[PDB]
């Protein structure tokens, strides 16, 4: 509901269904990358 995020893209599940599912475990990762390096986070990408 918050609009403060400028990058919210995922293909595993849909955001609208996050309130109707149970996860049984949650993993949270924190790291810093460059502005043009956001393309490297999706699973199965080309690069370094």
């Amino acid at each position: 509901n918050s609009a403060s995020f400028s990058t919210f893209k995922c293909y595993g599940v849909s955001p609208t269904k996050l309130n109707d599912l149970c996860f049984t475990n949650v993993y949270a990762d924190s790291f810093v990358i460059r502005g043009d390096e956001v393309r490297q986070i999706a699973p199965g990408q080309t690069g370094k």
């Binding site: 699973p43 199965g44 990408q45 080309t46």
Partner: protein, 48 residues
């Protein structure tokens, strides 16, 4: 009866020479040219 018994067997191996719309008809050539992340959907099409 001997003839079309041999024609059926010959056809099945001959079906392997066609790429079925994929990049190549050799599974090893797929890995040597394109990475697995976007190659698993043509290899899936080869299996079908």
């Amino acid at each position: 009866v001997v003839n079309q018994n041999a024609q059926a067997l010959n056809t099945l191996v001959k079906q392997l020479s066609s790429n079925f719309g994929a990049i190549s008809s050799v599974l090893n050539d797929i890995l040597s040219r394109l990475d697995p992340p976007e190659a698993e959907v043509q290899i899936d099409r080869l299996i079908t």
